[PDB]
Design a protein around this nucleic acid. Structure first.
Lengths: 169, 294, 58, 102, 159, 218
RNA sequence: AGCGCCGUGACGCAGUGGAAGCGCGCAGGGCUCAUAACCCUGAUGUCCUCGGAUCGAAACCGAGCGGCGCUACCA
RNA sequence: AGCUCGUAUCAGUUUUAUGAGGUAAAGCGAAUGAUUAGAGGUUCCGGGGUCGAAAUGACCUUGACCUAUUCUCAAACUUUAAAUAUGUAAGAAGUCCUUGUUACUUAAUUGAACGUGGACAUUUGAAUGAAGAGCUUUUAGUGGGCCAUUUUUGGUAAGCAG
RNA sequence: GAGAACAGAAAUCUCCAGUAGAACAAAAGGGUAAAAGCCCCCUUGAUUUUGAUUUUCAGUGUGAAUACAAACCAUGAAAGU
RNA sequence: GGUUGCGGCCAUAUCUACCAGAAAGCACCGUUUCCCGUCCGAUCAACUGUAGUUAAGCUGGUAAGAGCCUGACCGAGUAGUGUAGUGGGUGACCAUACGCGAAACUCAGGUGCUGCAAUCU
């Protein structure tokens, strides 16, 4: 049986970790909202080091969290730029995954000379239902190990879609 | 490997309380609500508990003792159909109606109902059940919403307005009933009365009827079967207010069967714990099968 | 020139000579420290009941 | 008892005193402040803070440190002069120059 | 220096308990308290308002006054050569009842029941308690119960 | 070059260990605690011989160290380095304080005496009782009188009246000989490098049968 | 015995929680037939060792290691 | 110096019942801190030695980490936890029944506090003893203390200091 | 722990475990997990009248704190605080 | 007896790994116009109860399970301790009399009970 333990996506998220604060961070935010259609959320520091040249609360980053048909469309577009070929070494221990890239305009973007070039960190959260059974206020619970997700079932579903293979290890 | 916690951790572990393990109460709020001014020694603190499932609402009048909480009244979307609502048993209006129902139930069972009648002609305004002169004061009750998000425009405050119109002295403020314009701190009684008699639901019915007939068939299917529309719903809500004020006296079911028959089927079909001798049989079977070297 | 700094020696003998007398308990104790709401209502109630009993047996 | 010999800092004048080691002697609450330096008007030195451009301040200490600083200002390059504020008679005491973060 | 403060030498005393940290249960609040009630005092360190002093930790007293979230308690206290009445405005998280008093009241109403039965029949109650009196004779048999003769065991080191 | 053990013998004062309060001690001279063929096994060395105490005193790391050397010297000289396993069984955590005065004639003028009595550390020590074992060894009956001679020498190095005892036990186990042997012709044991793992009657049958198979295949 | 100070490039001496200064010394080029001097340039500091607090210290607080200083009187 | 009363509105005590403690002792395959020694593993895994061009390829050794084990400890660690000491109750100022007061409280003659009227005696609410029980006034001297058992701090120790 | 370009042991993001091993101005000890911690919103009950009580204790004072009364307020849907 | 809501005691109730779940109730789930809030209708607000599934949550059972709780004619009257002795011992310490009496360990058992209201073959 497989009534509704069939797999799907929970969310896509897009992160950009700018080296410092400033016009660079504003431009990264502009890129993310131009793609997403929705305003982004900045990200502050945690502590201090000079090797990167940073301090506490210095506005290092930005990200966005998106869902649904738009998310999976962006995902499969990421896959076709990524030539439908990936790594079990890249793949995580849960079935969730992602990849960090350069040349963001490849996703079908009307480039502007101001923004320059920025690399990104895409991440993908797949699941089955019970998402709110863990993330609500009432009757909270930790899901069953059957309903949990894993490397093997997630990659098998992801491979039989597109018939797109990955590497051995 | 990772699926094995430590003996010392699991030993020194302190559980929470039961309802907190089940994710159902906030003892902060429960303490603040049931705890009582100790100059008023045995006189209780009457909560109006409200809770929200999918496909039902619960509203109860509750007090607190040492063995367990104790109930006076109740109200249920799944017994509203006596008084004349068939569909939309989780909406703002049914919540209001349940509040009205539990109010009339309390004042009926305590004889406080002839005086402090409440409100029948409704317009959607803020007013509390101010006491009579030289007579008994109205019933003082405090809302308990458990874990539910206090937010402007909720069926919980709808139920609250139902109680306050039904004749319960609940203290509150008009700054969370829908129509409460944020910047201009005044309530809108016409929008509130519209939500009473079904404004937003009728808007949804109207839009589905003008554009999306396939969804108009998928849902409101009972309204198609019963031939309901955007004036009938107001009329039935009004007549249902009248029926609630008429006969709130809780005729319950007949149960179709008996207690020990329900229990007979459940106990028959039930499981049971594997006793000491058959535990010995289990370990002995493992021995004779596997430690007997196949 | 140092000295004996402290000791509780012989203090309990001194006490238990004529010592650890219980406080005298009284009917109708002090109503100081008691809640004035209760004091006020209690005052008016006792005034009323004194009047009432004298009128019942005048 | 302690003999003390100390230099007046805003003036440069020696001060020797003596008093028992256990008796109380007063101390002020000296502070250095590291102020940056801009274009010098008439004799008043001109120092700004990170959150304020105020302080038509401590008036150009005439010492050999001061003259070298006067010469140093002619060739520029961010000049952070340090001062002190003991008992409200402010004066410049030392200095540092930038090399990065242009 | 010598340090003698309101919460000095109190570590293990206002230690909450093992596996009972966090909040408080509800019978502490739903119970009732009136003037003349005898009550115990143990302090709940999780409620840092309304506390008693460590002298009054683990003690017993009588009520004289009752307010919103608090209760008056009288205690007698040795100070030199007298017992002083000391009045405390404590919280019910730190209060609890005295089961000695509870069992005493139960014995009282049962004594009244015995006096009622002796009003019904006149049969010489002998109400007062009496200690464990010395016991009376009896005859122990021997059938299936012969006496086993015992004697000591020699000393073996057992290491 | 130390002050005498007669000055630091009895348990006159409470346990003063190393902690976050002292933080600064002079380390021991003993550093080895197990000697001989420690990687021997349980049935390999059956005899276990002890050194226990009938006093109640403190024993210094210096005495432990010298006694270790004397006993190990005797055994490794006469019966060889791999005919025994020696194990000390008391660790010195206690610490010993000294109010360091002067060693001159004319110290009167700057000594200051008992003002400032709290002394600084200058060593360590153990704390033992009745029956608390000091040394133990595991070897064979051929090596018996040899090893008890070694423990005899260690007695001669330690203060107080200490006794030697041949236990009723098989090695450093808490088990006695015939019960160990019935267990070993049975199958509840599985030797480690030094100690042994047992079969529980509690817990995972699957792990026991993953282990200890022959006892089930009796 | 008791108390206090100090440890910064090869050397001497400054150094203030946002992050190392000067002089000498050293190296390279040019003048000189060659070195010196001279003119144009550049570099080098676990800031005794360990731990701690701090978002982060050479600095701030313990441990140790080293070099010193001050006490040492009335008998 | 007395004063008000006359066997009790008491007790350096026991018993019954109920509380509170975290010291002795105990534990460290239980948390924190310290500590001894092995084995068995994981090397995308620290240092490497080898097979080889190298390969998350293969082997061997050696420090980590993980697994279960073992030995020793804690005045300023602890799950546990005494003995001795310690609070309170053992009724008449009490218990029950009925209804009076009130501006307090309750949805409410509901509840609280203090009362009216009535009932509950010889065992009127465990033991033992009570040499009278309670209460005030005024004033002397004293405010250098030492010794013993048991517990204990500093110190090697002391007819030492505490 | 398992991943995600630059990005490594340490930059930012996501999932799982996480009884507190963090944080609560500081010394140390208690206390706290839909909070007393972190963020957000609104405020000035850090207000007035004075009494009672605890601790040190002579049952004196100072300091600190506790629980009420009469007012006026804040915050919250409200109990409440 | 099962389920839901409000609970009392707050692990016999927890944790891990599976197995099962008649009916009913819960739940998963479907939708964004309305009040409302988010980077995002994921949380929360609102609408239907229709499309569907008992897979997850939830409930119960298994585990010579870890953990927790109880009992022992298990250790052990041991360790410790009150009172007495012109008791022993060089001393540390120990024995005796009248008394109280542990913890670790070993073994045996157990794995939530129950109140108010509504509901279910």
């Amino acid at each position: 049986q497989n009534p509704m333990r069939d797999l799907k996506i929970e969310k896509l998220v897009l992160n950009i970790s700018v080296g410092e604060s400033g016009d660079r961070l504003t431009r990264a935010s502009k890129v993310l909202e131009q793609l997403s259609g929705q305003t982004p959320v900045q990200s502050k520091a945690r502590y201090t080091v000079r090797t990167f040249g940073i301090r506490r609360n210095e506005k290092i980053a930005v990200h966005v969290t998106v869902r649904g048909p738009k998310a999976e469309e962006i995902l499969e577009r990421g896959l076709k730029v990524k030539e439908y070929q990936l790594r079990d070494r890249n793949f995580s221990a849960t079935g969730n995954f992602g990849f960090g890239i350069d040349e963001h305009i490849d996703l079908g973007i009307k480039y502007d000379p101001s923004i320059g070039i920025f690399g990104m960190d895409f991440y993908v959260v797949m699941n089955r239902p019970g998402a709110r059974v863990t993330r609500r206020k009432r009757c909270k619970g930790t899901v069953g190990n059957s309903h949990k997700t894993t490397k093997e079932d997630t990659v098998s579903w992801f491979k039989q879609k597109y018939d797109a293979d990955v590497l051995d290890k | 490997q990772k699926d094995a916690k430590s003996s010392a951790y699991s030993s020194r572990f302190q559980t929470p309380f039961r309802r907190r393990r089940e994710g159902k109460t906030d003892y902060y709020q429960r303490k603040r609500l049931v705890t009582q001014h100790k100059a008023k020694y045995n006189t209780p603190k009457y909560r109006l508990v409200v809770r929200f499932t999918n496909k039902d609402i619960i509203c109860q009048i509750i007090s607190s003792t040492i063995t367990g909480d104790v109930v006076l009244a109740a109200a249920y979307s799944h017994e509203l159909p006596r008084y004349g609502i068939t569909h939309g048993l989780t909406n703002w209006a049914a919540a209001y109606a349940t509040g009205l129902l539990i109010a009339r139930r309390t004042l009926q069972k305590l004889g406080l109902d002839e005086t402090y009648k409440g409100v029948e002609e409704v317009e959607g305004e803020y007013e509390l059940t101010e006491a009579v002169e030289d007579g008994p004061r109205p019933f003082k009750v405090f809302l308990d919403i458990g874990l539910q998000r206090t937010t402007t425009g909720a069926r919980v405050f709808g139920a609250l307005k139902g109680a306050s119109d039904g004749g319960l002295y609940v203290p509150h403020s008009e700054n969370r009933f829908p129509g409460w314009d944020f910047e201009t701190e005044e309530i809108d009684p016409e929008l509130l009365r519209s939500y009473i008699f079904g404004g937003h639901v009728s808007q949804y019915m109207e839009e589905l009827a003008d554009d999306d007939e396939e969804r108009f068939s998928e849902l409101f299917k009972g309204y198609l079967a019963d031939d309901i529309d955007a004036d009938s719903l107001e009329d039935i809500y009004t007549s249902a207010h009248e029926a609630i004020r008429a006969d709130p006296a809780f005729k319950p079911t007949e149960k179709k069967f008996t207690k020990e028959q329900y229990a007979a089927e459940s106990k028959k079909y039930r499981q049971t714990k594997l006793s000491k001798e058959e535990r010995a049989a289990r370990v002995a079977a493992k021995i004779a099968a596997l430690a007997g070297q196949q | 020139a140092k000295s004996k700094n402290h000791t509780a020696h012989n203090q309990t003998r001194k006490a238990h000579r004529n010592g650890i007398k219980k406080p005298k308990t009284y009917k109708y104790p002090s109503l100081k420290g008691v809640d004035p709401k209760f004091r006020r209502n209690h005052k008016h109630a006792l005034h009323g009941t004194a009047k009432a009993l004298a009128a019942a047996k005048k | 008892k302690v003999h003390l010999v100390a230099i007046d800092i805003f003036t440069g004048k020696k001060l020797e005193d003596l008093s028992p080691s256990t008796h109380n002697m007063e101390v002020p609450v000296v502070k250095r402040n590291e102020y940056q330096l801009l274009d010098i008007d008439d004799g008043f030195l001109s120092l700004m803070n990170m959150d304020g451009d105020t302080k038509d301040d401590v008036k150009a200490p005439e010492g050999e440190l001061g003259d070298s600083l006067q010469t140093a200002f002619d060739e520029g390059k961010d000049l952070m002069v340090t001062i002190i504020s003991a008992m409200g008679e402010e004066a410049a005491i030392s200095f540092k120059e930038a090399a990065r973060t242009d | 220096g010598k340090s003698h403060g309101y919460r000095s030498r109190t570590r293990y005393m206002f230690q909450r308990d093992f596996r009972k940290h966090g909040a408080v249960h509800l019978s502490t609040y739903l119970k009732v308290y009136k003037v003349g009630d005898i009550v115990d005092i143990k302090a709940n360190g999780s409620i840092q308002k309304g506390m008693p002093h460590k002298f009054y930790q683990g003690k017993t007293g009588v009520v004289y006054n009752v307010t919103k979230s608090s209760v008056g308690v009288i205690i007698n206290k040795m100070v030199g050569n007298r017992y002083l009445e000391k009045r405390l405005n404590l919280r019910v998280e730190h209060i609890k009842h005295s089961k000695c008093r509870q069992e005493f009241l139960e014995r009282v109403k049962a004594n009244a029941a015995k006096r009622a039965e002796a009003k019904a029949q006149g049969v010489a109650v002998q109400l007062k308690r009496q200690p464990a009196q010395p016991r009376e004779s009896r005859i122990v048999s021997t059938e299936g119960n012969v006496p086993q003769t015992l004697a000591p065991v020699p000393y073996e080191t057992f290491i | 070059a130390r002050r005498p053990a007669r000055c630091y013998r009895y348990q006159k004062n409470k346990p003063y260990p190393k902690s976050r309060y002292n933080r600064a001690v002079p380390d021991s001279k003993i550093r080895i605690y197990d000697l001989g063929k420690k990687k021997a096994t349980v049935d390999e060395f059956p005899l276990c011989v002890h050194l226990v105490s009938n006093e109640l005193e403190q024993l210094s790391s210096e005495a432990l160290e010298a006694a270790r050397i004397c006993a190990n010297k005797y055994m490794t000289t006469v019966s060889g380095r791999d005919a025994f396993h020696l194990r000390v069984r008391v660790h010195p955590f206690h610490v010993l304080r000294i109010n360091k005065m002067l060693s001159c004639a004319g110290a009167d003028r700057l000594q200051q005496g008992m003002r400032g009595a709290w002394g600084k550390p200058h060593g360590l020590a153990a704390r033992v009782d009745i029956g608390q074992i000091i040394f133990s060894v595991r070897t064979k009956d051929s090596n018996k009188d040899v090893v008890v001679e070694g423990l005899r020498r260690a007695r001669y190095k330690f203060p107080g009246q200490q006794k030697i005892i041949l236990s009723k036990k098989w090695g450093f186990t808490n088990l006695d000989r015939p019960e160990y042997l019935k267990k070993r012709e049975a199958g509840e044991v599985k030797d480690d490098g030094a100690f042994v793992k047992f079969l529980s009657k509690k817990g995972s049958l699957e792990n026991n049968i993953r282990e200890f198979p022959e006892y089930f295949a009796a």
